[PDB]
Structures are given as C-alpha cells and as structure tokens.
Ligand binder design. Structure first.
Ligand code: UDP
Ligand code: UDP
Ligand code: MG
Ligand code: MG
Ligand code: MN
Ligand code: MN
Lengths: 249, 249
C-alpha cells in the first residue's frame, strides 16, 4: 500500500463521528490505496471510537485541553478555537509525506487518489467568495514547522467564525493568483448543494454538506427510505444504512 | 487616448439603459483612458439614446431582427436568444484590438484600466459554480472568426436560461484549468452581494448586481436618501442622482 500517504478527517464528537464513518466507508467503497486516518478527541465516546477503528486505519487522539498538547498554549489565548486547533494537528502527522484532509461532512463518489499528484496547498474554490479556497478538502504536507506557524497565526489573528479557512487562506495567500494546478476542480469539493448543476453535477467526485444542517441531523425513515435535490442526502443515508450500520456486526 | 481599446456594455431596453448610464458614469469618475461603448437595440428609446450619447463615446445599434444582421439566421433557429445574440456582437467590434465587456448591472469603484494587461479570455469566477467564469466582466479580443464560432455554438447548443455564460464557458473551456493569469480577481466582479466580505469587500473594484432585482427596480426616496448591506445599492443611486440626472442639463 501507500503507507506514506493518508486521507485525514476529524471528529470532536459522536455526531460528526457518523460523518467520518460515512466518509471513510465511501473511500473504501471506491478502493483507495491510501491510509485512512481520523483525528478524534476524548469527547468522542469509547464506544464510537470502537466503530471508528473498524473503518479507519488510525484513530489518533488529540486533546487540546491536555497541557502536554502542542496547541494548549494557543488555546489559552484563544479558548474559543478548540475545534480548529484540533484540526490543525493534521499538519503534525509527520509519519505521512502527503495527506488529503477531508471534513467529516463530506462523501466520496469516485476514487480520488489522483489528488496525491498535487502539491501543498491544493484546494478547491469556496462558493460565495471564490478567491478563497474551501478548507474542507485539501492536499498538504505534514510539517512541524508549518504546524507551528499555523498555531502562531491562530494565536495572532483568531477566527471570527471558529473555522480554519481564514487562517489557512492567510497563510497560503498565494493560492488565488499562483499556480493553477493548486486549484482543485470544484467537483473534488462540491459544496454549493440549477443550470450549472444540471450540466456538471453528474461528474461530482466529492459532495460537501457545508452549512448548518448535516445529513445526520435528519431523521431517516426506513418505511419511505427518505429523510423527513435530497439526491446527495439520500446517498449519504444509503451508505450509512448499507455500509456503516452492519460494521456493528 | 487608447482609441484602440474600449469598455463595452449592452442595453436592449430603457431600464438596463439606466444601468449603463451609471456604469459609464462610474468609469469616467475613475478616469478611464479607454473608449466607452454601448451596444443598444431599437427597443431603446431615441430619447434614452440621446442620454447614452452623453456618457458613451459610441452608441452602436444592433438589431438581430434585421435580416442583414450577422446573427439573424441564428435567431431564427433560437428565437428565445435575442438578448444574448445581441451581446455576442461585442466580438464584432474589430475597430478595437482589446475590450472589457461589462454587464449594464455593474458599477466601478476604482480605475480598472489594468484589465487591459490581460489576454482573452480573462474573467472572474462565478460564485456558486466557481469553475465557470461569470460572463458579466471579461477581457476579450474582437474577431469575426470568434464571433461566428460563438454564433454556431449558440445555434447548436442554445441556452437554457437565455444567458451567454454557458456558451462562453463551453467555447473558452480551458479557463478553469489553464493559465491563472486569466482568472481575474473576484474584486473585479464582486457578484455575491459575511466574514469574507468583512475582510475583503472594502477592496472591491467592481460591484455586480447579479440576480433578479436590479438597482433601478427600487424606488428611491430623496427625503431619506434611501431605497424603499444596501451600501452598494446606495452607491448606485448616489451615482445615478449626483452624476447621471444632471447630464439631462
Ligand atoms: O463540533 C464540531 C465542528 C466541526 N468539526 C469538524 O470540523 C469540520 C468543519 O466543520 P463543518 O464541516 O461543520 O464546517 P462547514 O463545512 O459547514 O463550514 C467538520 O466536518 C468536522 O470534521 C468537529 O469535529 N466538531
Ligand atoms: O433584457 C435584458 C436583459 C439583459 N440585458 C443585458 O444583459 C446583461 C446580462 O443580464 P443580467 O445582468 O440581468 O444577468 P445576471 O447578471 O443577473 O445573471 C445585462 O447586464 C444587460 O447588459 C439587456 O440589455 N436586456
Ligand atoms: Mg508574529
Ligand atoms: Mg458544429
Ligand atoms: Mn464541512
Ligand atoms: Mn449582470
């Protein structure tokens, strides 16, 4: 296998854990040759970590509240940024030479191992402000150096919405104007879920359920096989019910 | 002056004419050294053309209903596409070596003559599907060849929404993946009118009132100096009342 490269996702709770299980299961379904990693916190229940270990190759515990954690000092300056400081540990994974970070609210529809042809920092434009890249799917190179610099920036600048996108766009500020090969096609992070979707949505590789209501916040009804287009939402729930639930033997 | 280069806009009626007057007036305010051109149709009233001649250097009449018009045969195949076939005449203006097309629902906030450093086809990403460029602001090279090919594509493919963006994106299909210098910064076509705008909206060069309701569809009240943020909307109306109305001596 490519033991040197991984898909890396994050969950700080049992709800986003359901996302990660669907993401990981979807990467396996499309036969990734790379490792699957999930960053998890002590807020994820032991019982959920046991399920995550059935999908992920590594469940890596990160606890920013631990005084021995690399991000703990930054957290005392910015106590509102625990989730994003947890996310930033993706750069601490120096056992890998290259990774694709994916949000736990994403879902893979095709093999996307060709993302490992890209260099740090390759990412898709954010709908709404497309000179910024969306931080939900990105190719990067773990580095303690880069990690510490992102921590400093988080300390200095903070994050109005608690997300990492501003910080990552501030650090990787040449993305908009430099090297078109670092622009991932939008189909690798399809996040604006009429006429553009009717022509190109069929070729989506990754769906991103960006925004307030996540697929797992819906109530699924087996009797109608529907939540109470929801095309993508139905596919999420199809993977969950078909591929995830039976991992619980 | 740069008699060889122009800003080119379009109006097929008196309502969008008000847009063009505000756009043209804004380009003059920021001291363009280029020519100002408006493509107009016989549906624009003579009285409005007289006002347009006070702002524009050239009011160029285009009538796709005239059997001598270059786009007339295409219109008989696609009678629903009169406006976009009118727009496509922007490529017939071979008296200019290079032009910036701007929609009549745009407004300039700074000198943007440095767009003439760009090559065809340079355009900003469309919010919502950012691997397509928005066809409301673009750098191009007039050519009868290119014109005829866009006409053919319009004939072959049509336009579901009546706009030209699909056609232009189909013809200039390498835009997303090739030559980052052909990606205009989003501030040259700021069309998604909270946190990204709070950091970068102040540096906007062009505002685009993309979507259903246009600034001139609002009712302005002098007693409150408001329509019945609307920051951009207020600036539109400020240019209209301050700079446009008094051109009517
Ligand atoms: O309470 C939270 C909030 C977010 N996340 C992680 O952070 C990512 C970014 O958050 P989200 O996708 O909700 O942001 P959006 O994509 O909606 O802006 C998620 O996918 C998760 O991987 C998490 O683990 N716990
Ligand atoms: O009836 C019309 C519709 C559109 N236009 C022109 O076509 C451009 C594109 O239309 P619009 O800006 O309304 O499309 P949007 O930017 O909202 O998608 C306008 O700015 C005008 O220049 C026109 O002259 N008459
Ligand atoms: Mg510093
Ligand atoms: Mg043909
Ligand atoms: Mn997300
Ligand atoms: Mn427009």
């Amino acid at each position: 296998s490519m033991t040197d490269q991984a898909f890396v996702t994050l969950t700080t709770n049992d709800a986003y854990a359901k996302g990660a299980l669907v993401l990981g299961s979807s990467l396996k379904q499309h036969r990734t040759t790379r490792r699957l990693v999930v960053l998890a916190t002590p807020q994820v229940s032991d019982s959920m970590r046991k399920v995550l270990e059935t999908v992920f190759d590594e469940v890596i515990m990160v606890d920013v509240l631990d005084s021995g954690d690399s991000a703990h000092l930054t957290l005392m300056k910015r106590p509102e940024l625990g989730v994003m400081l947890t996310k930033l540990h993706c750069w601490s994974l120096t056992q890998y030479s290259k990774c694709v970070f994916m949000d736990a609210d994403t879902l893979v529809l095709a093999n996307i191992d060709d993302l490992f042809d890209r260099e740090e920092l390759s990412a898709a434009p954010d709908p709404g402000w497309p000179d910024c890249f969306n931080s939900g799917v990105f190719v990067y190179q773990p580095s303690v150096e880069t990690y510490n610099q992102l921590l400093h920036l988080a300390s200095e600048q903070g994050s109005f919405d608690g997300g990492d996108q501003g910080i990552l766009n501030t650090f990787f500020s040449s993305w908009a104007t430099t090297d078109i090969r670092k622009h991932l096609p939008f189909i690798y992070n399809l996040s604006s879920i009429l006429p553009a979707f009717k022509v190109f949505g069929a070729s989506a590789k990754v769906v991103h359920f960006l925004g307030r209501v996540k697929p797992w916040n819906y109530t699924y009804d087996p009797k109608t096989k529907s939540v109470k287009h929801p095309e993508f939402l139905i596919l999420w729930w199809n993977i969950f019910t078909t591929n995830v639930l039976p991992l619980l033997q």
